[PDB]
Design a protein around this ligand. Structure first.
Ligand code: CL
Ligand code: CL
Ligand code: NA
Ligand code: NA
Length: 129
């Protein structure tokens, strides 16, 4: 599913991401925009053979099992394909583990490069939340 901006904000808010570990909702929307263009079905392969899955492009080297990333961990205990669902629950819960792992949202390179230090509240402006 390709989310609307406000629709995703709303879904993320319902799932407890608004200010999760200090990151306001606009951060999460911004990151999803640049990681996946709000498409839950987004995948991208990395040079290392790992793959990024879903709206927040969670990586199979550490966070999920795709059966093809040798030597990898599955720290969210989920098949990576669960991250592609139109229900963002699995993406959102795994993201909460990632953002808690010491590096905050710097774990998402697109956030660091495209969102961090910008006016991220613009991503939720106009939305009925
Ligand atoms: Cl694997
Ligand atoms: Cl980037
Ligand atoms: Na994801
Ligand atoms: Na894995």
């Amino acid at each position: 599913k390709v989310f609307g901006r406000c629709e995703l904000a709303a879904a993320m808010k319902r799932h407890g991401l608004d200010n999760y570990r200090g990151y306001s909702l606009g951060n999460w929307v911004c990151a999803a925009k640049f990681e996946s263009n709000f498409n839950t079905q987004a995948t991208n392969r990395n040079t290392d053979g790992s793959t990024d899955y879903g709206i927040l492009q969670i990586n199979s080297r550490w966070w999920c099992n795709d059966g093809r990333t040798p030597g990898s961990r599955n720290l969210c205990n989920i098949p990576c394909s669960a991250l592609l669902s139109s229900d963002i629950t699995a993406s959102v819960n795994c993201a909460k583990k990632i953002v808690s792992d010491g590096n905050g949202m710097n774990a998402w390179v697109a956030w660091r490069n495209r969102c961090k230090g910008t006016d991220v509240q613009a991503w939720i402006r106009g939305c009925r939340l």
